[PDB]
Swiss-Prot record, chain A:
This is V-type proton ATPase subunit D. Belongs to the V-ATPase D subunit family. V-ATPase is a heteromultimeric enzyme made up of two complexes: the ATP-hydrolytic V1 complex and the proton translocation V0 complex. The V1 complex consists of three catalytic AB heterodimers that form a heterohexamer, three peripheral stalks each consisting of EG heterodimers, one central rotor including subunits D and F, and the regulatory subunits C and H. The proton translocation complex V0 consists of the proton transport subunit a, a ring of proteolipid subunits c9c'', rotary subunit d, subunits e and f, and the accessory subunits ATP6AP1/Ac45 and ATP6AP2/PRR. Interacts with SNX10. Subunit of the V1 complex of vacuolar(H+)-ATPase (V-ATPase), a multisubunit enzyme composed of a peripheral complex (V1) that hydrolyzes ATP and a membrane integral complex (V0) that translocates protons. V-ATPase is responsible for acidifying and maintaining the pH of intracellular compartments and in some cell types, is targeted to the plasma membrane, where it is responsible for acidifying the extracellular environment. May play a role in cilium biogenesis through regulation of the transport and the localization of proteins to the cilium. It comes from Mus musculus (Mouse). It is found in: Membrane; Cytoplasmic vesicle, Clathrin-coated vesicle membrane; Cytoplasm, Cytoskeleton, Microtubule organizing center, Centrosome; Cell projection, Cilium. The chain holds residues 100 to 149 of 247 of the full protein.
Swiss-Prot record, chain B:
Non-catalytic subunit of the V1 complex of vacuolar(H+)-ATPase (V-ATPase), a multisubunit enzyme composed of a peripheral complex (V1) that hydrolyzes ATP and a membrane integral complex (V0) that translocates protons. V-ATPase is responsible for acidifying and maintaining the pH of intracellular compartments and in some cell types, is targeted to the plasma membrane, where it is responsible for acidifying the extracellular environment. V-ATPase is a heteromultimeric enzyme made up of two complexes: the ATP-hydrolytic V1 complex and the proton translocation V0 complex. The V1 complex consists of three catalytic AB heterodimers that form a heterohexamer, three peripheral stalks each consisting of EG heterodimers, one central rotor including subunits D and F, and the regulatory subunits C and H. The proton translocation complex V0 consists of the proton transport subunit a, a ring of proteolipid subunits c9c'', rotary subunit d, subunits e and f, and the accessory subunits ATP6AP1/Ac45 and ATP6AP2/PRR. ATP binds at residue 144. Its main location: membrane. GO terms for molecular function: ATP binding; proton-transporting ATPase activity, rotational mechanism. This is V-type proton ATPase subunit B, brain isoform. Disruption phenotype: Morpholino knockdown in the whole cochlea, especially in hair cells and spiral ganglion neurons causes a dose-dependent hearing loss. The keyword Nucleotide-binding applies. The gene is Atp6v1b2. Belongs to the ATPase alpha/beta chains family. It comes from Mus musculus (Mouse). It is found in: Apical cell membrane; Melanosome; Cytoplasm; Cytoplasmic vesicle, Secretory vesicle, Synaptic vesicle membrane. Kidney; found in early distal nephron, encompassing thick ascending limbs and distal convoluted tubules and in the alpha-intercalated cells of the cortical collecting ducts (at protein level). Expressed in epididymal clear cells (at protein level). Mainly expressed in the organ of Corti and spiral ganglion neurons, in both the early postnatal cochlea (P2) and the adult cochlea (P30). GO terms for biological process: ATP metabolic process; synaptic vesicle lumen acidification.
Length: 50, 250
C-alpha cells in the first residue's frame, strides 16, 4: 500500500525441497555449490527488481 | 467602568442615540481628565438596522441594498472620534463588534466597517464547533499597526519574530494535516509529526484559555517560546540567530 492505490509485490521463498545433488560429474561438487550460491543471491536481487 | 444599556424593547430611535452619548462621555474623560479610555461597541448591525428604519420613516429614497447612501458618512463620524491628541496625555481606543448576515464577507456593513477602520479580527464557526474557547481564527486575522505598537522597551525584544514563527509553524501544520489526510500517515516524516504536534499543542494551550485565566503578555510569550521549543532552532528559520543564542536554549 504505497499510496491510496495498492500495488502487488513479491517475496523470496525457500520452498524447502533442497537443490539436487550431482556428485558424479568427475567429482566437482564444490564449484557447483559456489555457483548455486551465486545464482541464489542473484535471484534474490532479481525478485526485488521485479 | 461606565455602562450603557439599550434593550431591544426600548424605542428604536434610542438605538442611534446611545453611541453618541457613549462617545461624548469617552471624549470628556479622555481629553479633560488625561486618562486612557477604551470604548467597546456591540452589535453595530442593530445600529445599521435602526438607522435604516429612521431613514425609511423619513421618506428618503433608498440607497444600496435598502441601506441609506450616507451610511458611510455616519459610520465615519462615529468611528473617527478616537486616536491621540498632541499635548494631551490621553487616548481613545475603539473595538467595535458586529455580526455578518449569512457569514457573507461582502455584506455592506462589514465592507464599510473594514474600509473606515484599521485591521480586522475573525472568529470562525468551525473552531467554535470544535468546542474551543475563545474560537479565534488567527489565519485570516490581520493587524495594521502591529509593527509600531510593539518594540524594545515597551515590551521584550523577542515579540515580532515569535509571532512570525508561530504563524508560519501553524500554517505549515494545518496545510500538512490537509496533506496527510490523503497522503497517508505512513509516508510522513518525523518532522511532519513534529508539525502535527505543534498544531495540536497550539490549539490546546495557546488559544484555549478559559473565561477567567487572566494571561499577561509575558505569560503569552513564555507559552509561545515553550511551543517553539519542540523543534530545533534550525527549523525555526524566521528567528534571528542573535536571539536564538539567548532564548531558544531555555
Amino acid at each position: 500500500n504505497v499510496a491510496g492505490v495498492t500495488l502487488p509485490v513479491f517475496e523470496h521463498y525457500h520452498e524447502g525441497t533442497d537443490s539436487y545433488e550431482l556428485t558424479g560429474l568427475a567429482r566437482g561438487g564444490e564449484q557447483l555449490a559456489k555457483l548455486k550460491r551465486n545464482y541464489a543471491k542473484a535471484v534474490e536481487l532479481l525478485v526485488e527488481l521485479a | 467602568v461606565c455602562l450603557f444599556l439599550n434593550l431591544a424593547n426600548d424605542p428604536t430611535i434610542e438605538r442611534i442615540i446611545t453611541p453618541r452619548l457613549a462617545l461624548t462621555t469617552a471624549e470628556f474623560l479622555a481629553y479633560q481628565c488625561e486618562k486612557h479610555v477604551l470604548v467597546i461597541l456591540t452589535d453595530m448591525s442593530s445600529y445599521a438596522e435602526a438607522l435604516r428604519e429612521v431613514s425609511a420613516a423619513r421618506e428618503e429614497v433608498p440607497g444600496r441594498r435598502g441601506f441609506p447612501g450616507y451610511m458611510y458618512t455616519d459610520l465615519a463620524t462615529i468611528y473617527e472620534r478616537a486616536g491621540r491628541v498632541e499635548g494631551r496625555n490621553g487616548s481613545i481606543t475603539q473595538i467595535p463588534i458586529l455580526t455578518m448576515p449569512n457569514d457573507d464577507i461582502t455584506h455592506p456593513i462589514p465592507d464599510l466597517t473594514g474600509y473606515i477602520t484599521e485591521g480586522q479580527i475573525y472568529v470562525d464557526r468551525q473552531l467554535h464547533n470544535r468546542q474551543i474557547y475563545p474560537p479565534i481564527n488567527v489565519l485570516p486575522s490581520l493587524s495594521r499597526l502591529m509593527k509600531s505598537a510593539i518594540g524594545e522597551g515597551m515590551t521584550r525584544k523577542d515579540h515580532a519574530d515569535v509571532s512570525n514563527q508561530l504563524y508560519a509553524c501553524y500554517a505549515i501544520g494545518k496545510d500538512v494535516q490537509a496533506m496527510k489526510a490523503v497522503v497517508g500517515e505512513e509516508a510522513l516524516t518525523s518532522d511532519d509529526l513534529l508539525y502535527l504536534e505543534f498544531l495540536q499543542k497550539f490549539e490546546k494551550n495557546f488559544i484555549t484559555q478559559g473565561p477567567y485565566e487572566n494571561r499577561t503578555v509575558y505569560e503569552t510569550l513564555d507559552i509561545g517560546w515553550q511551543l517553539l521549543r519542540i523543534f530545533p532552532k534550525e527549523m525555526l528559520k524566521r528567528i534571528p540567530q542573535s536571539t536564538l543564542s539567548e532564548f531558544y536554549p531555555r
